[PDB]
Amino acid sequence: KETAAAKFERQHMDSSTSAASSSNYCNQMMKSRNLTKDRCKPVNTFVHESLADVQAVCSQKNVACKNGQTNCYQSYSTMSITDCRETGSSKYPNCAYKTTQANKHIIVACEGNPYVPVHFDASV
Numbered sequence: 001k002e003t004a005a006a007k008f009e010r011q012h013m014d015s016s017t018s019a020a021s022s023s024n025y026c027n028q029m030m031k032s033r034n035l036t037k038d039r040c041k042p043v044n045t046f047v048h049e050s051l052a053d054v055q056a057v058c059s060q061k062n063v064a065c066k067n068g069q070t071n072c073y074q075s076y077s078t079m080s081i082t083d084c085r086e087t088g089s090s091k092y093p094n095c096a097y098k099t100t101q102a103n104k105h106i107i108v109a110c111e112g113n114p115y116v117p118v119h120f121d122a123s124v
């Protein structure tokens, strides 16, 4: 279908912009990245840093993932991110999201060879 690494890039990377522009940023990106195609994905984070900088997190601070696995890594520094959260009124297929732009550390799960990000765990 799509490799685990390519799925993570499509769902979470937005290196083209340095930050969310408007309050309509999530509504647009969630659709263009096809995250509202069968349902409205409730939460989704987009990272505004280069792909190389995001893949480097895999060799930074090892921490437990929310599920208890230990292949999660936190960035040593803060990164520009956009948190997208479904609104209380939102109803598929008319998905509506609330956009929050912020600078935070990210936590990702990595796997493979090369060892790259395959899952977005959280923003701290």
Ligand SMILES: Nc1ccn([C@@H]2O[C@H](COP(=O)(O)O)[C@@H](O)[C@H]2O)c(=O)n1
Pocket: 043, 044, 045, 046, 066, 119, 120, 121, 122, 123
């Ligand atoms: N801060 C967060 C928390 C979760 N997520 C996304 O939400 C999805 C489900 O998250 P949980 O597994 O934490 O419920 C993850 O697959 C990840 O893509 C996110 O993108 N940003």
